[PDB]
Design a protein around this ligand. Structure first.
Ligand SMILES: *[C@@H]1O[C@H](CO)[C@@H](O[C@@H]2O[C@H](CO)[C@@H](O)[C@H](O)[C@H]2NC(C)=O)[C@H](O)[C@H]1NC(C)=O
Ligand SMILES: O=c1ccn([C@@H]2O[C@H](COP(=O)(O)OP(=O)(O)O)[C@@H](O)[C@H]2O)c(=O)[nH]1
Ligand SMILES: CC(=O)N[C@@H]1[C@@H](O)[C@@H](O)[C@@H](CO)O[C@H]1O
Ligand SMILES: *[C@@H]1O[C@H](CO)[C@@H](O)[C@H](O)[C@H]1NC(C)=O
Ligand SMILES: *[C@@H]1O[C@H](CO)[C@@H](O)[C@H](O)[C@H]1NC(C)=O
Ligand SMILES: [Mn+2]
Length: 536
């Protein structure tokens, strides 16, 4: 008995496609001064004024892969308990999340929808929410007795679920067309596989719906434990780009997992606080202890990434203590790589992690070395546990004008001006930043090679100036080369770096070896590194 089935509710797709109105089809909302106010963000970190003006049943673009519409899945699948943790979430944003589930999910595959109130103090989340959800049979509200935080809140929900697999979602998401079956099917085939849908963006301003940059990518992180996304290496890339693909680390709130398998792993470290950490612990657990983690390209859910965090966090809580707890129990020797960047994580009491450590042994999991080597082998490529030395660092002095490269500390995107060399002898009042580093990544960022900033030398046109745009280990507009001719050749622009003898900014122009306004000289260097990525 393994009969397939097409779960595409076509009629729906049609009626949703013929829907009209603001925000419809995922388009940006017609902003007006009335919605641009600073008070429209104060409660959620995202524009609640706009959300209120958008339909709780709005329609979304089907930005799936062309193949996804043609897939079919097991006629019979295990039911799921969709669990949603919330804390002072906005009325319209939360309602929309649920509607999207009640309308885009096959009722039969939905055992129950449990909203879990994490001690919210907002009035609309009390009686009104109750009366509103009462009209919806499958929906159920379960509150906590005190502020637990997202981890414990998700645990409470998971401890009451009755469905075959547990699905977690944030309280400000919008599931797209036919998302649930592809997550359930995959688990029906492999009970120990955790599945994560493609997480799309919902603009915290105009609410347009759209895929994140680079779309389908692999999860990972830097050594300060900030979640990161990196390209799927070619050797791992699947034949059919719409098929499930392994991922090292999950994003965090959007994922499904078999209920038994979940608890078999011990769920989350109850010691984790309000936010952050549970995504790494759960991620290392599935892998190191026999399971697997996969992204289902055919399954997409929108999520509103906050502009800032509104809720308050209890005193005596630190993201650090969480990470440290995870670092001790699963990362082994690699934890030391976290401390080298953040020393305070050494003499920082990570509470009692004895119980968890005991869970790790009772599971017979592999070492963290195994994880990094077989599952996350590409992460060290962009985030090496130890970074290669730099090529050149210090002050960039232009031979032509004799002046030094400077920056009025305009990290938002200010041009790369040119001022008189300070050398650290100048008055620290003229906001002078004449220190730079040609990092191993082949990019140029401000600051000492030990304390660089996440801003790189970004240059578009082979004539445009040079700005400081957010970096990214993707040799493009931030790819530079320092040649024997003392120039900063920009291959992606075919031009070189040139300044103005009329005391202005710096701009791109035709390369000219025998010149001066394009000849620069760093203070310190390591030819051994320069001699590297200089050849084709
Ligand atoms: C928006 O969504 C709500 C809830 O999903 C829709 O109301 C439900 O409609 C279904 C359709 O058969 C009924 O089974 C439910 O009983 C309805 N719920 C309630 C409590 O009335 C609502 O009709 C949708 N509105 C739009 C714009 O289509
Ligand atoms: O103390 C908290 C903080 C957050 N949340 C909820 O947990 C989910 C994930 O948190 P959040 O969205 O703030 O994290 P983010 O996606 O921004 O990283 C959301 O549904 C929140 O409402 C919670 O229940 N308790
Ligand atoms: C969109 C998404 O997955 N957000 C998650 C959030 O829900 C939470 O799990 C956090 C760790 O506390 O990590 C984030 O990446
Ligand atoms: C399906 O969902 C129901 C309702 O939560 C649950 O009782 C049952 O154990 C699940 N599994 C079956 C029998 O399909
Ligand atoms: C780059 O120069 C540094 C000196 O600062 C040296 O330690 C390093 O070995 C050189 N690059 C390599 C790894 O060959
Ligand atoms: Mn969220």
């Amino acid at each position: 008995g393994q009969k397939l089935k097409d779960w595409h509710d076509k009629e729906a797709i049609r009626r949703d496609a013929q829907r009209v109105g603001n925000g419809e089809q995922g388009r940006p909302y017609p902003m007006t001064d009335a919605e641009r106010v600073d008070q429209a963000y104060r409660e959620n970190g995202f524009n609640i004024y706009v959300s209120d003006k958008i339909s709780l049943n709005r329609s979304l673009p089907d930005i799936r892969h062309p193949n996804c519409n043609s897939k079919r899945y097991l006629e019979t699948l295990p039911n799921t308990s969709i669990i949603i943790p919330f804390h002072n979430e906005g009325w319209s944003s939360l309602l929309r999340t649920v509607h999207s589930v009640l309308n885009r999910s096959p009722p039969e595959l939905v055992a129950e929808i449990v909203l879990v109130d994490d001690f919210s103090d907002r009035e609309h989340l009390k009686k009104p929410l109750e009366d509103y959800m009462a009209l919806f049979p499958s929906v159920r509200i379960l509150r906590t007795k005190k502020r637990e935080g997202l981890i414990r809140t998700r645990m409470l929900g998971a401890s009451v679920a009755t469905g075959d697999v547990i699905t977690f979602l944030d309280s400000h998401c919008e599931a797209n067309v036919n998302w649930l079956p592809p997550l359930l099917d995959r688990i029906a085939r492999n009970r120990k596989t955790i599945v994560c849908p493609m997480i799309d963006v919902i603009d915290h301003d105009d609410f347009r719906y759209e895929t994140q940059a680079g779309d389908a990518m692999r999860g990972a992180f830097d050594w300060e434990m900030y979640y990161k996304r990196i390209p799927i290496p070619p050797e791992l890339q699947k034949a059919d780009p719409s098929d499930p693909f392994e991922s090292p680390v999950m994003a965090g709130g959007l994922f499904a997992v078999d209920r038994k398998w979940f608890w078999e792993l011990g769920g989350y470290d109850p010691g984790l606080e309000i936010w952050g950490g549970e995504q790494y612990e759960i991620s290392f657990k599935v892998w190191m202890c026999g399971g697997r983690m996969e992204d289902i390209p055919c399954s997409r859910v929108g999520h509103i990434y906050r502009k800032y965090v509104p809720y308050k966090v209890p005193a005596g809580v630190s993201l650090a203590r969480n990470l440290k707890r995870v670092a001790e129990v699963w990362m082994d020797e690699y934890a030391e790589y976290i401390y080298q960047r953040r020393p305070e994580y050494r003499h920082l009491s990570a509470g009692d992690v004895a119980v968890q450590k005991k869970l790790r042994s009772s599971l017979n999991c592999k070492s963290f070395k195994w994880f990094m080597t077989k599952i996350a082998w590409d992460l060290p490529k962009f985030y090496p546990p130890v970074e290669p030395p730099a090529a050149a660092w210090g002050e960039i002095r232009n031979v032509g004008t004799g002046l030094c490269a400077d920056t009025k500390h305009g990290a938002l995107g200010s041009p790369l001006r040119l001022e008189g060399c300070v050398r650290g002898r100048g008055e620290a009042a003229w906001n002078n930043m004449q220190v730079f580093t040609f990092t191993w990544r082949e990019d140029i960022r401000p600051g000492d090679p030990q304390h660089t900033k996440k801003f790189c030398f970004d240059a578009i046109s082979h004539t445009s100036p040079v700005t400081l745009y957010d970096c990214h280990s993707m040799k493009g507009n931030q790819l530079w080369k320092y040649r024997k001719d003392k120039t900063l050749y920009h291959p992606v622009s075919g031009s070189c770096m040139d300044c103005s003898e009329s005391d202005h900014r710096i701009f791109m122009n035709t390369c000219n070896p025998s010149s001066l306004t394009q000849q620069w000289l760093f203070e310190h260097t390591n030819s051994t590194v320069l001699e590297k990525f200089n050849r084709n």
